[PDB]
């Protein structure tokens with residue numbers, strides 16, 4: 001069995017190996033990458049996403065989200081308070097302001113310490129989940145706007161044609177902006193490209209150990225657990241590495257820098273934070289190996305998790321027994 005300790009693997013494909021996306025994902029899995037839940041892909045040196053980032057300031061962040069925390073430093077939830085619209089230029093200025101900018105630090109490890117110590121005492125503003133793309137239409141390799149769609153994958157594997165579309169999302173981050181512990185909708189893969197700016201630190205639990213994280217989460221967030229049997233789908237709960245170590249949950253951590261891709265694998269729980277002003281692009285995708293995870297994915301039916309149009313068909317076809325109850329949650 002490849003990669004039995006479930007370490008995060010880093011890949012350096014050649015330009016020739018960067019042509020065929022599906023084939024490279026399948027190569028990575030042949031080497032055990034999926035066992036970690038997360039992999040890093042450094043593109044060939046010849047590759048670029050686009051020529052420059054000099055003309056992005058007029059993108060609109062229609063609903064910036066202020067991430068307000070409650071709890072203790074290592075075990076907290078966050079809620080998202082909607083703020084007034086602002087452009088990317090306005091947001092970048094705010095990120096760089098004395099109130100919100102990254103503090104002086106020695107290295108990534110010192111910054112990580114400061115994050116876990118102090119995150120709860122501040123409420124950073126995240127421009128998340130903005131439909132769109134920063135890949136140039138002429139970038140032919142690993143262009144997240146030109147991937148094969150999940151609906152076409154389901155059709156190719158299972159023969160059923162379904163409605164729905166699959167498009168990327170932009171994330172504009174600042175210091176302390178935070179992604180809570182989650183897997184993807186329907187336990188899909190995700191791919192994330194950091195286009196510009198400061199790094200993003202990731203934590204991940206191997207898929208084979210996801211249920212250990214869930215059991216801890218039910219203990220640490222007992223009211224949330226009673227409210228919903230899949231409350232991590234709400235994407236609001238944070239647990240520090242110190243807390244995970246104290247409770248013996250297996251995990252790994254890695255920092256993504258500008259110009260690098262990360263891939264999350266089916267049922268790989270992940271969380272993390274941004275180091276300063278940045279912009280990432282991400283999209284879900286599927287492979288043949290995903291199908292069995294989609295059939296087994298937990299679902300939120302309490303009404304909180306509220307998701308895309310396109311998840312309807314996945315639940316309807318892969319989880320017909322759950323469909324009625326899940327749809328009640330959606331309506």
Ligand SMILES: O=C(O)CNC(=O)C(=O)O
Pocket residue numbers: 171178179190191192264270280282283
């Ligand atoms: O970058 C972020 O805020 C969150 N991204 C992801 O969870 C992902 O790419 O799967």
Ligand SMILES: [Mg+2]
Pocket residue numbers: 055056057058059
């Ligand atoms: Mg612009």
Ligand code: NI
Pocket residue numbers: 182183184190264270
């Ligand atoms: Ni994710």
Ligand SMILES: [Zn+2]
Pocket residue numbers: 227228229230231233234300301302303304305
């Ligand atoms: Zn729920």
